[PDB]
């Protein structure tokens, strides 16, 4: 259940962030040049508005998903360590019992 996260969720989201970085870097230049060489400037304008809105929404969505995945991963690891602490405490108690028995 933790492997599903570690191996493919977080790395996949990071690759998605890199892809968004590249795409947005290209879309900025495309929008600028399109406005410069556009017959109607108004139409180019609301199109640029649409691209900026889409970019903001997509980036926010991606960041939100990565944050959620990291949060869940950390919580799972904390649970594992709590369980393993309990088991280690039990082993320590058993060893102490054995040593006291030997002494007696």
């Amino acid at each position: 259940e933790l492997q599903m996260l570690l191996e493919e969720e977080i790395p996949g989201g990071r690759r998605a962030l890199f892809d968004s970085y590249t795409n947005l870097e290209r879309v900025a230049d495309y929008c600028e040049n399109n406005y410069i060489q556009s017959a109607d400037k108004q139409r180019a304008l609301e199109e640029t508005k649409a691209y900026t809105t889409q970019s903001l929404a997509s980036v926010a969505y991606l960041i939100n998903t990565l944050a959620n995945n990291v949060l869940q991963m950390l919580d799972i690891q904390a649970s594992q360590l709590r369980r393993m602490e309990s088991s280690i405490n039990h082993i320590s108690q058993t060893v102490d019992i054995h040593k006291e028995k030997v002494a007696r």
């Binding site: 790395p11 989201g13 962030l17 890199f18 590249t22 870097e25 900025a28 929008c31 400037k41 640029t48």
Partner: protein
Amino acid sequence: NELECVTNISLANIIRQLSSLSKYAEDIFGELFNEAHSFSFRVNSLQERVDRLSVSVTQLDPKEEELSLQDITMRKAFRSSTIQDQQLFDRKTLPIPLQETYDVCEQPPPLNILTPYRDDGKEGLKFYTNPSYFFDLWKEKMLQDTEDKRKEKRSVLLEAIRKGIQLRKVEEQRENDVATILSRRIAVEY
């Protein structure tokens, strides 16, 4: 100038800012994920060890347990780990974005090429910038201060314990770490 041109330029600028933000967010998330992955590796190793130790402990035999009175001290004592972190600001530790902004800064003059011609056999650039200078100066100050302070100041188990004390006496204890230098200074000061 028409205003719509300025507004469109600004829109392109904010999209560029969005792309930069995406890269920076990716950097942060990768920095988190790497160390989380390291924790996962350590947890798996410790779990394997705990499973082994539990199956081993469940089959300890007290009645068969035998303790060697003669070997009480010739046995090697258990020592806990003593790892202590230092040099936390080496260049290796530099984050990635800070390195990116560091690499666009102006480099010192190529003053090393003069090195093969220098009679002293010292580096050419060490006369222009010596980051190790602070450490060297501090060490030198510490060494002379310590020396000045020093100058101013001036049955069979019986066999086993005997062997243990002999080993302890002979096997006594045996630098460029600041902590060691301070410890020596204060110890001499006492």
